[PDB]
């Protein structure tokens, strides 16, 4: 609840536009009721950037999230575009650039379960019903996925190929680090996941997590390997808080929460570096078909947009608000099409209305 | 009708015994109904064979497991041994030079909901009627668990540990094989669980399934990414029959599956070398709380004599029957100690009468 913010906003294509209009709608609401000065500037990306700029990623646009304390992006690729790949994607061309060009290590992806949707979770009723919140935290830029040597050796019978699974420490005390702090905006319990009887990496990390720790005395933390962990999601995911990853741990990890949530589509994602800048946007995935009929679900990006305030404005108690306001046209039965038993009762635009008529705490 | 068949039965500790001799009940029957001929003989390992022997692994057990077409193994270890070595007393000094001596390189995993147990069932119930019937196989051998080089290195930032994810093109191809054989024996799917997307180990190992799939033009194959199969074991069990792993990609996916039939005390353990040689035996352990001829669950081992018979003995009509028996005794609510309120429970021994009876046949 403060003055000074500025935020880049990249809708994109597709959905990217009509779903970012009611997130605006929503900061809007965010502005008024906690009396925070945040602007916002608009910029192309991916197609319309394509289209605009002939670039995926124009190099201003580059510019302006530099000057911004945080990036809500949207959708890219929706239209007509990659007939020239890769890195001459949207995608690829804008999205992962990013990534690179500002640090972004880390991606946290929350697994909610909404009061509103205990039945479309695929776990027994009698657990869905204690339901859950875990936050999954996840290692982004090294690990097995980029580890080096790297390749393929020989022919015949011996013909082998590896990967190797290498961490620093430099890369296990900052992701950890990101876990500790997100934990105490929570519920301050970590959950370190490994594999530390057989990974030589996974005994440098969890050795390397027992020493951070201790600079987070409040915070609970304990250690699970992988197997386990899968097993748990399932049996009970009311005991987890904060999920702190490696790169393929948690690639599993937060694929399996997201499952258990049952509906997905509606996810946020957030990317940070170590000094509180993200970019925060929607899980789902873009369009197409479904672009410029008002059908859209926007809860991922009103999501991403709750995660933006909580992460890089600090603003825990606006992003708990957006939070109650989903969480209240969820229990009341208001989809854009995910229960018309007598009509998906809302639009993107009205359900863009609906949340920020309840931050502002008008119904 | 007949055989030539012999077995090496090795009990072990605690519940080992008393599960052990309601599996031969059930050999009994077999030998009776198919007209096979099966011999078996005893031998003393792991903590029988540490005070009758003094040792874990008698030269003996060894002698004999060399004379037999498989080894029906029951458990092994109490509190009362293993205060001296590791690798020297009762597991480690007993069941893994087993599995070295005899080149066992696959494990198979099955993960079946049974009908009268569908309420301990962790997912929805609608997920739950579909039932699942899941066999997955695992490299024991290779992959990350045991690549070299392993190690950690260095100090300050750039300290680092590493683990290399080697597979060579015979290792892929030998459990590729046992897959694809198990698949004819089943409903004539294999799914291979790689993360092709970006590691050169898994790309290899797609590669090879590939090939091995032409030698077996009646089976049906897919590829899967181990975060998907994570997700889809979730969401729709229903749609899997073998799944083929590597080492680390089997171990999660075993559990996850052990997990979601909610009767992890039931499912047994198959580990095969090359030429149809298995060791068989209890996914779990004794229960030397609960060591004491009568309330140990029998049917884990005798699901142990049903993978047996159909794998090493290649005798799947008399599997099956096991199957069908121990299917027929669960439904109709008759079970040792997972449900009790009409003092209904049951011995270890007349849950082995009653197995044995069904598969003589009935009435």
Same mark, same amino acid.
């Given at each position: 609840? !403060?003055? %000074?913010? @500025?935020?880049?906003? #990249?809708?994109?294509?597709?959905?990217?536009?009509?779903?970012?209009?009611?997130?605006?709608?929503?900061?809007?609401?965010?502005?008024?009721?906690?009396?925070?000065?945040?602007?916002?500037?608009?910029?192309?990306?991916?197609?319309?950037?394509?289209?605009? @700029?002939?670039?995926?990623?124009?190099?201003?646009?580059?510019?302006?999230?530099?000057? $911004?304390?945080?990036?809500?992006?949207?959708?890219?690729?929706?239209?007509?575009?990659?007939?020239?790949?890769?890195?001459?994607?949207?995608?690829?061309?804008?999205?992962?650039?990013?990534? =690179? @060009?500002? =640090?972004?290590?880390?991606?946290?992806?929350?697994?909610?379960?909404?009061?509103?949707?205990?039945?479309?979770?695929?776990?027994?009723?009698?657990?869905? *019903?204690?339901?859950?919140?875990?936050?999954?935290?996840?290692?982004?830029?090294?690990?097995?996925?980029?580890?080096?040597?790297? &390749?393929?050796?020989?022919?015949?019978?011996?013909?082998?190929?590896?990967? /190797?699974?290498?961490?620093?420490?430099?890369?296990?005390?900052?992701?950890?680090?990101?876990?500790?702090?997100? $934990?105490?905006?929570?519920? @301050? =319990?970590?959950?370190?996941?490994? =594999?530390?009887?057989?990974?030589?990496? !996974?005994?440098?990390?969890?050795?390397?997590?027992?020493?951070?720790? /201790?600079?987070?005395?409040?915070?609970?933390?304990?250690?699970?390997?992988? +197997? %386990?962990?899968?097993?748990? #999601?399932?049996?009970?995911?009311?005991?987890?808080?904060?999920?702190?990853?490696? %790169?393929?741990?948690? +690639?599993?990890?937060?694929?399996?929460?997201?499952?258990?949530?049952?509906?997905? &589509?509606?996810?946020?994602?957030?990317?940070?570096?170590?000094?509180?800048? &993200?970019?925060?946007?929607? $899980?789902?995935?873009?369009?197409?078909?479904?672009?410029?009929? %008002?059908?859209?679900?926007?809860?991922?990006?009103? #999501? !991403?947009? *709750?995660?933006?305030?909580?992460?890089?404005? +600090?603003?825990?108690?606006?992003?708990?608000?957006?939070?109650?306001?989903?969480?209240? $046209?969820?229990?009341?039965?208001?989809?854009?099409? +995910?229960?018309?038993?007598?009509?998906?009762?809302?639009? /993107?635009?009205?359900?863009?209305?609906?949340?920020?008529?309840?931050?502002?705490?008008?119904?």
């Amino acid at each position: 609840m !403060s003055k %000074n913010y @500025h935020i880049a906003v #990249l809708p994109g294509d597709g959905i990217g536009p009509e779903v970012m209009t009611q997130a605006l709608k929503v900061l809007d609401a965010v502005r008024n009721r906690f009396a925070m000065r945040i602007t916002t500037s608009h910029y192309d990306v991916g197609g319309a950037a394509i289209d605009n @700029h002939g670039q995926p990623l124009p190099p201003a646009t580059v510019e302006g999230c530099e000057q $911004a304390d945080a990036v809500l992006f949207g959708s890219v690729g929706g239209p007509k575009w990659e007939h020239l790949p890769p890195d001459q994607q949207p995608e690829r061309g804008a999205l992962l650039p990013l990534r =690179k @060009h500002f =640090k972004l290590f880390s991606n946290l992806r929350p697994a909610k379960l909404y009061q509103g949707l205990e039945a479309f979770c695929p776990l027994r009723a009698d657990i869905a *019903a204690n339901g859950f919140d875990i936050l999954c935290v996840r290692e982004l830029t090294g690990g097995i996925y980029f580890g080096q040597p790297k &390749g393929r050796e020989g022919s015949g019978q011996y013909e082998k190929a590896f990967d /190797t699974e290498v961490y620093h420490r430099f890369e296990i005390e900052r992701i950890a680090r990101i876990a500790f702090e997100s $934990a105490r905006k929570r519920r @301050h =319990k970590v959950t370190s996941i490994d =594999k530390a009887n057989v990974l030589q990496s !996974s005994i440098l990390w969890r050795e390397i997590v027992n020493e951070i720790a /201790t600079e987070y005395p409040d915070v609970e933390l304990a250690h699970m390997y992988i +197997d %386990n962990a899968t097993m748990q #999601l399932i049996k009970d995911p009311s005991q987890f808080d904060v999920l702190l990853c490696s %790169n393929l741990f948690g +690639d599993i990890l937060s694929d399996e929460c997201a499952m258990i949530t049952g509906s997905m &589509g509606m996810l946020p994602s957030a990317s940070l570096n170590e000094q509180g800048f &993200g970019l925060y946007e929607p $899980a789902g995935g873009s369009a197409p078909d479904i672009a410029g009929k %008002n059908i859209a679900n926007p809860i991922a990006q009103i #999501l !991403s947009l *709750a995660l933006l305030l909580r992460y890089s404005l +600090d603003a825990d108690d606006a992003a708990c608000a957006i939070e109650r306001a989903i969480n209240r $046209a969820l229990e009341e039965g208001i989809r854009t099409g +995910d229960l018309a038993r007598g009509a998906a009762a809302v639009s /993107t635009d009205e359900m863009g209305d609906i949340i920020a008529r309840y931050v502002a705490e008008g119904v």
